[PDB]
């Protein structure tokens, strides 16, 4: 709508009517949605500095169980680089909600989780 307003403003200023179809830039939604899913950088390409990363990942097809697991994965807000035991701990409230066993070993222990079965 910002570019629809900008495009229509130029034509209305000149005194001529504007073509609505020519005002719409279809790349804005097509490429914006595609780019965020394509790269996983969440937000805008120009503003990748504040864009959340790792939201979109290539689906794991090593095994059927790995494929299912990747579709039920949970990412903790805490950054992987940062270290803090408490977010990595198995909180009581994960009962029935998050698998108490499935978690990667290494920097991501306790930060990447998987949904409980039901």
């Amino acid at each position: 709508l910002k570019e629809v307003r900008i495009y229509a403003q130029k034509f209305i200023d000149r005194g001529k009517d504007f073509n609505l179809e020519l005002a719409i830039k279809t790349r804005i939604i097509s490429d914006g949605l595609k780019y965020s899913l394509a790269t996983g950088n969440w937000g805008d390409q120009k503003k990748a500095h504040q864009a959340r990363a790792g939201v979109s990942q290539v689906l794991n097809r090593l095994t059927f169980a790995s494929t299912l697991s990747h579709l039920r994965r949970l990412n903790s807000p805490i950054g992987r680089d940062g270290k803090l035991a408490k977010p990595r701990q198995l909180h009581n409230t994960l009962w029935g909600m998050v698998c108490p066993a499935e978690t990667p070993e290494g920097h991501a222990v306790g930060l990447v989780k998987n949904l409980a079965l039901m």
Binding site: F11, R14, G15, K16, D17, F18, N19, E21, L22
Partner: protein, 88 residues
């Protein structure tokens, strides 16, 4: 049904027709332009060249040439340099 093939856009033929119907601005005699030019100065002390053209309805080059002989440009730092309709 989108972007259906068309030889010319409807908004474009209307603007083209309006421009053709209105026609190009004609170069009137100097005396008439001067008389109309000064009458405009009466309403407002200062006039912008772009807006002044509309009042005179004369070609920009022709208006500038006649305005240059008598009118002068005064530089204003607030917005820009504009023309002065006062001969002095």
């Amino acid at each position: 049904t989108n972007y259906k093939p068309v030889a010319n856009h409807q908004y474009n033929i209307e603007y083209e027709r309006k421009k053709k119907e209105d026609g190009k601005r004609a170069r009137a005699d100097k005396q008439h332009v001067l008389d109309m030019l000064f009458s405009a100065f009466e309403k407002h002390q200062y006039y912008n060249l772009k807006d002044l053209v509309d009042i005179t309805k004369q070609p920009v080059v022709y208006l500038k040439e006649i305005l240059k002989e008598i009118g002068v440009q005064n530089v204003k730092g607030i917005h820009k340099n504009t023309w002065e309709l006062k001969p002095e």
